[PDB]
Amino acid sequence: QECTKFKVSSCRECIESGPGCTWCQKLNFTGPGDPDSIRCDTRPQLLMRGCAADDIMDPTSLAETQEQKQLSPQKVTLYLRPGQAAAFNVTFRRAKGYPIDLYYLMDLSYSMLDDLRNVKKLGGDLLRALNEITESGRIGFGSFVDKTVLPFVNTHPDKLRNPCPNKEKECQPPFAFRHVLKLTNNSNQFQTEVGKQLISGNLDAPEGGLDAMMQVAACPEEIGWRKVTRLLVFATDDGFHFAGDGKLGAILTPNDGRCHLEDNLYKRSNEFDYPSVGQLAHKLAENNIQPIFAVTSRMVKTYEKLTEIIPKSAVGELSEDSSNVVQLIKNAYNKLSSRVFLDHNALPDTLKVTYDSFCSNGVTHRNQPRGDCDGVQINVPITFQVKVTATECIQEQSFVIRALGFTDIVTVQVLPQCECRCRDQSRDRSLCHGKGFLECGICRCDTGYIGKNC
Amino acid sequence: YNLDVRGARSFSPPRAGRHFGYRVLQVGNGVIVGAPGEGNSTGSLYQCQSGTGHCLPVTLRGSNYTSKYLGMTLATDPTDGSILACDPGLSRTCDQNTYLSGLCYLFRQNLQGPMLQGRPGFQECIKGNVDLVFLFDGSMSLQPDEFQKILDFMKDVMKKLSNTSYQFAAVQFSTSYKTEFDFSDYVKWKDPDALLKHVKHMLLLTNTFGAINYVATEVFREELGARPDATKVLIIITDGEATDSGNIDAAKDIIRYIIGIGKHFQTKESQETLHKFASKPASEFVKILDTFEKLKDLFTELQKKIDLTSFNMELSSSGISADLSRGHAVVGAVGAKDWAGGFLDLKADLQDDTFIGNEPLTPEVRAGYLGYTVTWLPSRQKTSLLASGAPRYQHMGRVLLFQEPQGGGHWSQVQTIHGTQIGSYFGGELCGVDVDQDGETELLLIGAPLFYGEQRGGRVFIYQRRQLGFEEVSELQGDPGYPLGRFGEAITALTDINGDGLVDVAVGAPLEEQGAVYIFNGRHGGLSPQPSQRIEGTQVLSGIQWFGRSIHGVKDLEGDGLADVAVGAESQMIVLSSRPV
């Protein structure tokens, strides 16, 4: 409704000036004394000056979509006038479940001895639960304790051989991360491999579970992930170390987020400091792995806070014996899958994007940096309204819009609208005067004298 | 806005490791660089000469031990020029247990000058097998009731420690010394009442030196029942000062507690006379009791301290952080009280310490790592404070504020500042700032370098001191686009680098690509929320990494420039100069 002009010499520089400025293409809108900056102002100010409605150029942002699919449309082209948003709709239809890869990363410290007994027998029940959810799941297994330096474990040679209390016969030395079982649909393979594992121990309370998860996400070929749904089950009864804690063991080198598995062990764990929580959040979202924290009653409210950071994550209360884990994993798949996040990749400071979330459960959010719906049911559609705004005349660019936890994307091609798209190729088609051609009611002569009327 | 990047100088020894540059310290005549080892290499300090461009390893003379941890902790006192270096890597085994504490070195003058050393928060090893000797005063100064209450204490101690691997012996001393029973005499009876049946009050002088030497040579013997594989422990009970002089060097290998009792130890000057007979620190091994009836209450302190699952000071990791102000040194002990944490108030000679922790001790404060950071907040008219971060508290982290002892008083805990995001390491870096240089430190800067979200990693929050306490007034904003860049891993007051009389602050973000340093100029009323300069590491050196892991700047007085700033990096240490330009 208001227009500030500064440089204007053309229809393009007019639209570039501001989102309220409009241009009059009428032939002869300029009296001789006046310059031709006068063709650009607010629409009411143009009408004031005798310009007709039809002769006013008011380009508006536009959204042209190219399009049963879970996430539609698949491609969008935007024409962005500076300061005016364009609005296109994304619809999310939750498909019937994908196959599920589930990796079981277990705390093998001594308080988990009774836990470990039950879990060696749970491979059958696990696949049953996966196949009850969907079709043709797989399972895997890994175990962790902590790094093997002071004061995280006791480094006294006897306690390195038996980190458990001295009574224990069947006990294994502490270790960072052991990859026990590749992802397989065979239970008895799970049973023989997981049955080979022994209990262990360590010294100070928190544990290197985050080291192990970083290895699970950084070694996709060793774990054997399919390009399907990926669940990582984190079962523990203690807290966790993160970056900065390694300083007590004189480990000052940050985690590099690379696969350091050798012989299915994380051998260089004493070289690298623990990962930061966010570093793990970044790696889990890249590889589309969704963690499920199965923690005892005393750890629940702590691991709940992790879900504020890692969007696709779930917490469940594990029993002291890890017996209820199968009912915990189902409840967690339900919590993960019934909530949807619609986010975009990294953007420049020039573009701004917001999301109106129209959810099926009868709840509406508007103008948010991220689309968020919960209560999502299978084949019950939900609509996201995306509003993209450009601050200036933009260079050609493209970004993607993802449904978090899924690889399906919406490719958004962003194009500027800095040009006016005017009229009258013809009618009389009669004019400039000197050799040179017309564009938008103001001649732009061919090089060769130039000037104005030509 | 004015640090001459184009004139940047880089320093690096030929054998330097990756953690050369973990701590940088500017003391006139050059830079001190900490170089904690990596792998099986040990740690070292480096004196970097300003003119030569050569960094040389520092030799610690009289240093008996040096670990991978050396150079992890560097600090200096601006008031007197002292340098404190600590080595939190003193690891030893006590039975099947490993202990972890620190070894701190103080350079009053310079690195080439005289060195002091102590072991803050160090727990001596009491093994399962202990040979304990009671050495009790029989002087004429003891009323027959007091001398009786001393024998009752020895009996009650042995009664508590029957059915342990402790074996006992007792020696009365006055002018001479008599073994009341040997270790084998305890093996044949385990009767504290029948072993002291024959003891008779000597009623003579108090000769402590010769008594301790007597116990060293004559009482600890195999033929008298002393196990050579056992920890030797001596407990001295005396009601006055010693009537002889000399040295107990023969008894150095023995752990010595000493208990002064009664009116003769009312003056503090008479209490410090007991210090030389006992082990260090004196705060642990010297017990002053004003009355004799307090010998019965004492059982909890002196029985208990003499395959763990619950820890006090064994894994204290003392000296993992330090700060010095006005001749007063503190080191943090993150492992104390089951990694609840705390800090140690050090005697100026490093021969004694005092532990200050969380109060109360709840399950919630455990594994919080209090003392990961320590920063003095001095002031003249207002009271001086000590802020310590517990970056792991409840997995979110917090910062506690302690007030110096006032008058007779002790340390008090005056405020708590909690973090709101898990794993953010809120309080993993602290920095006191006095913007306008009035002698009053108004600002507490708190780092949360692992903070995640909103397309920038790490945060620095600005707290200002009010009448009630520290209030959050602002935040130092770093550039977005590095969500894991760890903005806030290093925060230092830079003195004044634009010559406007207002102190400026640097913040390192060592994981933003190859590292960066943000300069925040001080304004009137506080700090500017927006940076005036951002130094990328890639500009200074091509292969550089972790640029900004450690920052220290000072007004340097030989050379061209306003201020000099030393910034550490991976294998590198870099000096920048402030200019009027």
Ligand SMILES: *[C@@H]1O[C@H](CO)[C@@H](O)[C@H](O)[C@H]1NC(C)=O
């Ligand atoms: C505009 O009007 C002028 C006379 O006022 C005339 O010379 C010129 O040809 C006109 N231009 C057009 C494009 O009609």
Ligand SMILES: *[C@@H]1O[C@H](CO)[C@@H](O)[C@H](O)[C@H]1NC(C)=O
């Ligand atoms: C998207 O759908 C909503 C209803 O869910 C509708 O109100 C809106 O008009 C649509 N968006 C656009 C840009 O038309």
Ligand SMILES: *[C@@H]1O[C@H](CO)[C@@H](O)[C@H](O)[C@H]1NC(C)=O
């Ligand atoms: C396990 O997976 C393989 C790979 O697709 C498949 O060929 C095999 O039939 C599966 N085993 C079953 C379904 O029992």
Ligand SMILES: *[C@@H]1O[C@H](CO)[C@@H](O)[C@H](O)[C@H]1NC(C)=O
């Ligand atoms: C270092 O320890 C040795 C014994 O190993 C001892 O002889 C020496 O006096 C100690 N050094 C200092 C400075 O106390």
Ligand SMILES: [Ca+2]
């Ligand atoms: Ca259990």
Ligand SMILES: [Ca+2]
């Ligand atoms: Ca541990």
Ligand SMILES: [Ca+2]
């Ligand atoms: Ca001030």
Ligand SMILES: [Ca+2]
């Ligand atoms: Ca300044």
Ligand SMILES: [Mg+2]
């Ligand atoms: Mg006496």
